[PDB]
Design a binder for this molecule. Structure first.
Ligand SMILES: N[C@@H](Cc1c[nH]c2ccccc12)C(=O)O
Ligand SMILES: N[C@@H](Cc1c[nH]c2ccccc12)C(=O)O
Lengths: 104, 104
């Protein structure tokens, strides 16, 4: 095959990759912090923490939803997905997380 | 009125590391995409294409006239650090970016 510089995707996947590309290639050494602040920092530090923290919070023991709206985080949907995530989330996740989840 | 105005203070570094640490270990297997849609997906997918449009354009897109504050499409705030992204940038980055900017 001979793709000419990939293609112009319709959805957001190019600029996206930029933020990533540096983020990853950086952690290799230690610039990921200064880079993180370059293309990721506002709703990011807020909403991104949340999601990886609400899911890793209840998907660790058994449950935990009666924590009442934490407002600063959400309190409506994103808080109750971590549960149904069993299906909601992709399937290729159980393939790896079996290991990144029980290992912790 | 009182909430979300000037009380900015949230030294996050835990849930944060999850989003990161999780990715780093995944990019190896190559499933960081399905995971991204997890630790990042809403204001993230957007606010990201943003900081990237500005940063990336500031380098080879010098032409930045049909962008100056299109108001609802970026944030007038975004385009401010973008003027100081110059001085205030980290130094040792000049030694790495040679590689993360020219090559990719
Ligand atoms: N559900 C979205 C992102 C998301 C919303 N709420 C969440 C709570 C935790 C983690 C991720 C989410 C996804 O995974 O595509
Ligand atoms: N690094 C910026 C985050 C950001 C918001 N808008 C931007 C525009 C360009 C680059 C980054 C941003 C900050 O310190 O808040």
């Amino acid at each position: 095959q001979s793709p000419y510089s990939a293609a112009m995707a319709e959805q957001r996947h190019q600029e996206w990759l930029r933020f990533v590309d540096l983020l990853k290639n950086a952690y290799q050494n230690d610039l990921h912090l200064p880079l993180l602040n370059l293309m990721l920092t506002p709703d990011e530090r807020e909403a991104l923490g949340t999601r990886v923290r609400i899911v890793e919070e209840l998907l660790r023991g058994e449950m935990s939803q009666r924590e009442l709206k934490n407002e600063l985080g959400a309190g409506i949907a994103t808080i109750t997905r971590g549960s149904n995530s069993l299906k909601a989330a992709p399937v290729e996740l159980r393939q790896w997380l079996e290991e990144v989840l029980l290992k912790s």
